[PDB]
RNA sequence: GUCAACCGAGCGUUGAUCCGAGGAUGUCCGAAUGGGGAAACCCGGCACGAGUGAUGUCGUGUCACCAGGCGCUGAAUAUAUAGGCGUCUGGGGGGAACGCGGGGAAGUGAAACAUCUCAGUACCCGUAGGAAGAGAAAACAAAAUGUGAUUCCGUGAGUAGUGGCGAGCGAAAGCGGAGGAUGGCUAAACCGUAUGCAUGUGAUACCGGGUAGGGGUUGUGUGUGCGGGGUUGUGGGACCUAUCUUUCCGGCUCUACCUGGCUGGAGGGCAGUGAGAAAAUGUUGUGGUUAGCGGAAAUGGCUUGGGAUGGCCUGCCGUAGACGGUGAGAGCCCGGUACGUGAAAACCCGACGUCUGUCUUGAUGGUGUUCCCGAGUAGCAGCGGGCCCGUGGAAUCUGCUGUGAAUCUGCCGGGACCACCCGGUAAGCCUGAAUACUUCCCAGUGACCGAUAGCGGAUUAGUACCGUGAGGGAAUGGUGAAAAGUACCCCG
RNA sequence: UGCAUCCGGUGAAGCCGCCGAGUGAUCGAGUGGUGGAGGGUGUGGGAGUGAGAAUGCAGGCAUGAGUAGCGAUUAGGCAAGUGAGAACCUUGCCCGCCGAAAGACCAAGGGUUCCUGGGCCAGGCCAGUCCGCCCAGGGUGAGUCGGGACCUAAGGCGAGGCCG
RNA sequence: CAUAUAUCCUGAGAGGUGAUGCAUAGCCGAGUGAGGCGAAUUCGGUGAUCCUAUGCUGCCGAGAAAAGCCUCUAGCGAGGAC
């Protein structure tokens, strides 16, 4: 739920900064949604994980 | 024993026959040391090298 | 090419007080290749001496560990096959007593 | 072969032992891969052989998983997909350092400590290479008519700055050098063609003119693939349209005929294992590496001595007086050195050709407009990273979540921002030399150690030994010139 | 260690003495003995350059000291032998101890300790002719026993796979 | 149709066989010890924590799996079974 099967997005790593400026490690996870990909318009759906960026760009077809 | 030059003209059958011939001698030699009645130690060395010579000649003809 | 020969299996006889006693009852004991099996020697010995073999018994011997100055050396392990000839009983003269 | 000899046996001028190069054999474990397993030991299938009166038995092959091609097959289910088969090519593991991209502490300093430092260090992960990374301006610069890809050294500079402005941290511009390739190729707009999905007023439409024939270069669309076309910042390029124009032939530009283009086949250049395409093939080079060989001159005299290489005195070589050895300090005794010579074969560098590709069906310079110039990208916003810069007025670079443009009077940079000016032309990709390293191999060097030193290891060395395991981990060199290592007798 | 000089198998360094010397660290190219192969001096250069102590490290050796101990709750004795050597070895005859063991057979564990011949500087808490010690040779025989080739439990590994 | 000590299965043990063999108390010379011969072997008493017994009888705390053996067809079959 952090690596897209199409674009290979990865979770960015960073430091959460508090009011007292205490740096604590954390990650920025991609918005990766479960999608039923229809590779061929015939209509056999396969289950994959695709980032919300790839859905918007139309890289996966839900037919 | 036998120089490779003369071994490189026997047909395949003669080499194989010579090969089982020598293994008779090697087996006989091995029993004589265990009994203890054989004096010429180096006879073992010549026989073992003789077998290797025949194998090499046979192996060359399979590819060379 | 590789040519097999039953004389590969049988290395040499073993000479000892026990072994000579067994010969009197027509039982010969050899030192064989460590990876042979009772059926293989029985076939091999029949082919070599052209005699009828009744049964074969084999045992594994662990080499003695002899102390030396440089270190603790260990001799070679071996397998012994104690083969009993059948009633036809052609004495093996090549054994050389 | 050796510690390391003693016995028994043999080889060698018909060339042994030795040294170099290429082959053959290479049990079993190990990524271990037929199945299994407590690594080096148990059990097999299939085919071909060998062997018994036949089962038993023995050899030679072959049988793991995954990925990618390729051919057959296509479940529930109809198209078809998953999946199943058969077959070809690949992976998997190891390695001392150096590279690149990720993850990332604490002791410690701050005379406490959380921001900060230690430090993007130690360690971990994924990955190559002989080097890697970076690289051909959406760059610096500051009005100079300047530089002109990257990388790596020296300066700039412990400065400008940054910092509980505490401890500390710390650039760049410019200038001087190393290397030379300021190198290359694409995508778009247009054409031609092959298609796949549609459709067709299925006709007056598809080709430049004219003559005519025709009803499909489908009439029209579109997407994909492939050949031309183009690679640019004084914007460039497509279309359009004027001037000159360095081989022959053929078929196409719906068709045949006179005019403009497309493509094939023969002269001529131009390049090639390269970044600019790739696989080979010969010939050659006293070119190189992997064994070696030659190589001058004192048995000199006298004295000390067990021994001369010591002392004294005579010669001699020297392109050789480097270094070792030989009974004590040796250029002339030995191995060698100076200086020459040596390759059957294998490998490596070149070079000349077969061979491969490209230009010639082509170029040169001119005029005024429409189309193109890399999209979920740039920009903006929220939360972070990192830059001298700790969020600050915070530019440039970058990650995640939203929002989300233009195609040249366009877009981005010139430290918030705005206007003017200047530079450049992002969202495509390759690129040697300068540079870092040494597991290993060859030749050397030391105002380095000389046995409690130097490697932990001059000797059984990661051995003995300790621990269940990760792991910890020692001590021991010297007779003499030669073994001539005390025959024989006496006490025991 | 640069450079310049002198000594040395007719005997250097090192070590042990005698006789002396300097205001100190120290000196002796003054000399005897041991020794067997390198040393001294002048002037420069560079130091892993001076230990009495860190409950400092490694090796050797003292004091305690010929002292404590010699590892149960059973117990030995005599005759003979071998032997250079005998309380401890062998043989015989007595005595005693265990006898749900201190007897007999295994699994795990060990790995040649088992038997024969030989040895008595090392070890045995003494000596030892003996030995679980040292050396050489020998020994382990399965269709039916405990296992594999037959089967599963807990559990481990795990084609594809899901998750990360 | 059956309640039979009917029938069948299981099964300690007694009995025969294995056994004219083996072995033993002892007897001989012989001596490291080799060798030879070798008698009687009935009745009871006691008696198990072992066998019948994975049984039987009670109880609640409700007491491994698979191969194996048997059977059934599906399926192979002109040879096959004893």
Curated annotation (Swiss-Prot), chain B:
Q: Which UniProt keywords apply?
A: Ribonucleoprotein, Ribosomal protein
* GO terms assigned for molecular function: structural constituent of ribosome
Q: Which GO terms describe its biological process?
A: translation
> Record's Gene Ontology CC terms?
cytosolic large ribosomal subunit
Q: State the family it belongs to.
A: Belongs to the universal ribosomal protein uL29 family.
- Which protein is depicted? Large ribosomal subunit protein uL29
Q: Provide the species name.
A: Mycolicibacterium smegmatis (strain ATCC 700084 / mc(2)155)
UniProtKB/Swiss-Prot annotation, chain C:
What the entry lists under InterPro entries is as follows:
Nucleotide-bd_a/b_plait_sf, Ribosomal_uL23-like, Ribosomal_uL23/eL15/eS24_sf, Ribosomal_uL23_CS
UniProt keyword terms in alphabetical order: Ribonucleoprotein, Ribosomal protein, RNA-binding, rRNA-binding
Q: Name one GO cellular component term.
A: ribonucleoprotein complex
The source's superkingdom equals Bacteria
Q: Which GO terms describe its biological process?
A: translation
GO molecular function terms noted in the UniProt entry: rRNA binding; structural constituent of ribosome
What does this protein do, in the record's words? One of the early assembly proteins it binds 23S rRNA. One of the proteins that surrounds the polypeptide exit tunnel on the outside of the ribosome. Forms the main docking site for trigger factor binding to the ribosome.
Homology family: Belongs to the universal ribosomal protein uL23 family.
HAMAP family the UniProt entry points to: Ribosomal_uL23_B
- Quaternary structure, from the entry: Part of the 50S ribosomal subunit. Contacts protein L29, and trigger factor when it is bound to the ribosome.
Q: Give the protein name, as stated in the record.
A: Large ribosomal subunit protein uL23
